[PDB]
Structure 1
Amino acid sequence: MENFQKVEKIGEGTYGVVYKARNKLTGEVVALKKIRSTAIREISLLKELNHPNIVKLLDVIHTENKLYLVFEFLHQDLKKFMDASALTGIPLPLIKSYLFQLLQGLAFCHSHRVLHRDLKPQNLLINTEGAIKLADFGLARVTLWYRAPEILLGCKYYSTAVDIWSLGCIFAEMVTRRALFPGDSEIDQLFRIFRTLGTPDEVVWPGVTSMPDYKPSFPKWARQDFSKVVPPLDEDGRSLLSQMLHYDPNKRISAKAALAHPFFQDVTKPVPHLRL
């Protein structure tokens, strides 16, 4: 729009390009998302879901039959910071803090029946104060890596539990500095999950064999021990990770119960060292 001035492209998201821009009135620096009546109304509902761990939706501009979303701007995403930190890894107290703030954002959005659906490191925004915020939230109203097994098996009516799964994938990833389930198609994603966690069955996930894309021809893999999966994570963290990675979405821990997990007993808020 004319009221703005792109400083630069800073992403191509699922929903079109993303720009750093300045408001020519306010002088504020914002993130500008160009999209590409229900989308209009649901959008403007999103403008009210405000919280410290949720990137603020500043303004929704429907003009010339286009739809720009103006967000509070942050300088770094977690993918970038994770690469920057690949040599020693993010320190555990900072992994823990990030995990805890994200679970707060999730808890908050979930309490309004709003879900993200597409969590992944690049949607996770960090600042110099040691905060981390969830961006893009509620707008599904290429990466398969963080996708919950119920989405993969063709569940159309999935829950908040899907975000808990993605965040569990991102938690593991921060700890080990490798992607947990780097699938490069839908079946390969599914089968990577099966190989680590065991092919699910009616015992561990009642109803699984009834899902749309479940095939009885699925190979049957035995589950691996978590000590092998996310070392050198302590038994608190692994415990918590296993409850986030439950197959049954009704067994999977809520963001709210996860906040009360013993892992979080010694949580602090360290500050990262960022090169902006």
Structure 2
Amino acid sequence: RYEPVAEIGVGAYGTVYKARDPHSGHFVALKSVRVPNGEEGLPISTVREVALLRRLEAFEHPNVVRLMDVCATSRTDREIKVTLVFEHVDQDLRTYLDKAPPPGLPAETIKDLMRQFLRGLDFLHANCIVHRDLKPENILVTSGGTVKLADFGLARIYSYQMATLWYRAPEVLLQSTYATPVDMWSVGCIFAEMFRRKPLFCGNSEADQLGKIFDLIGWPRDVSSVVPEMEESGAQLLLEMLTFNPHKRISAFRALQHSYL
């Protein structure tokens, strides 16, 4: 059994409490998801998607949180509650950036967090995984300097129970793409927030959210510059990220090998 003793908060994926692993001692992040108890028991999608994520642990990739256990519970004739047990970082990004010595830099903290960040992001993409909901609430960082991506692929789990526009790429929700480049956009959005320490193109409905973007950046439609806080190559790159067309757009792998080192 696990026992809770905090709450990282109310996230896109519900309440994320916090417990201890009795014998192991370590801290654990507990999430949950309600799924339908059909006549075929555990819904296929849930068994499969969940298991695809436990599998990932096999790689031991440091820039990604470890789903350590999973436990289903509720057995009402019509619902099941699946408890996701994760690896716990104490401080996420948002808290970790505030802290930072004004003006909140240098770069050999950013440059290397943008590196750790892009690694865990290419890995996922290697395993045919998209994050789609990439946030600094997520991007946890250990009291040791290791960034560890946060709540991946869970979009396809929470489809039931679900039934912040701050970071979504132009593809969403203008359509619903759920492509892989969607993460390369929200990298540029988080990329800047490292500097300014908060969201360019944040707030409001898809209209404004997507309107705000055509301010800077300029398939089409029918409605309505750089402004950099220190680097050129960081702009040369962050604009390759924040390209409109996802096809002619940067890759987490490409990115990691850009002159920006």
The corresponding residue for 1:204 is: none
Uncovered stretches (5+) of structure 2, i.e. residues with no partner: 35-42, 75-79, 157-163
SS of the residue aligned with 1:61? strand
User: Distance in 1 between the 2:88 and 2:202 partners?
Assistant: 29
Q: Please tell me whether the aligned partners of residues 168 and 245 of structure 1 are also in contact (alpha carbons under 8 angstroms).
A: yes
The corresponding residue for 1:11 is: 9
> CA offsets per residue over residues 193-239 of structure 1, 9 Å max, x none?
011111xxxxxxxxx13xxxxx42x11xxxx2x2x1x322x211111
Picking from 152, 168, 173, the partner of 1:147 is 168
The corresponding residue for 1:97 is: 112
The corresponding residue for 1:76 is: 91
The corresponding residue for 2:161 is: none
Q: Does 1:160 align with 2:167?
A: no
The alpha-carbon distance between structure 1 residues 83 and 249, as it changes in their structure 2 partners (threshold 3 A), is same
SS of the residue aligned with 1:60? strand
The alpha-carbon distance between structure 1 residues 157 and 177, as it changes in their structure 2 partners (threshold 3 A), is closer
> How much does 1:86 deviate?
7.0
The alpha-carbon distance between structure 1 residues 20 and 161, as it changes in their structure 2 partners (threshold 3 A), is same
Picking from 227, 233, 238, the partner of 1:236 is 233
User: Distance in 2 between the 1:243 and 1:39 partners?
Assistant: 36
| 1:67-216 → structure 2 map (5 Å cutoff) | 67-85=82-100, 87-141=102-156, 143-154=164-175, 156-198=176-218, 208-209=219-220, 215-216=221-222
> How much does 1:251 deviate?
0.8
User: Distance in 2 between the 1:193 and 1:26 partners?
Assistant: 47
Picking from 32, 42, 48, the partner of 1:41 is 48
Picking from 232, 244, 248, the partner of 1:247 is 244
Q: Please tell me whether the aligned partners of residues 110 and 194 of structure 2 are also in contact (alpha carbons under 8 angstroms).
A: yes
User: Distance in 1 between the 2:69 and 2:27 partners?
Assistant: 13
Q: Please tell me whether the aligned partners of residues 92 and 175 of structure 1 are also in contact (alpha carbons under 8 angstroms).
A: no
User: Distance in 2 between the 1:238 and 1:262 partners?
Assistant: 11
Matched letter for residue 75 of structure 1: D
The number of aligned residues is 238
SS of the residue aligned with 1:140? helix
> CA offsets per residue over residues 167-213 of structure 1, 9 Å max, x none?
11001111222311112211110110011111xxxxxxxxx13xxxx
User: Is the helix fraction higher in 1 or 2?
Assistant: 1
User: Distance in 2 between the 1:21 and 1:177 partners?
Assistant: 30
> How much does 1:146 deviate?
0.8
Uncovered stretches (5+) of structure 1, i.e. residues with no partner: 199-207, 210-214, 265-276
Matched letter for residue 115 of structure 2: F
Matched letter for residue 242 of structure 2: L
Q: Please tell me whether the aligned partners of residues 16 and 34 of structure 1 are also in contact (alpha carbons under 8 angstroms).
A: yes
Picking from 252, 257, 260, the partner of 1:260 is 257
Q: Does 1:58 align with 2:68?
A: yes
User: Distance in 2 between the 1:157 and 1:151 partners?
Assistant: 6
Root mean square deviation, CA, Å: 1.6
The corresponding residue for 1:22 is: 20
> How much does 1:15 deviate?
1.8
Say which is worse superposed, 10-19 or 240-249, in terms of deviation.
10-19
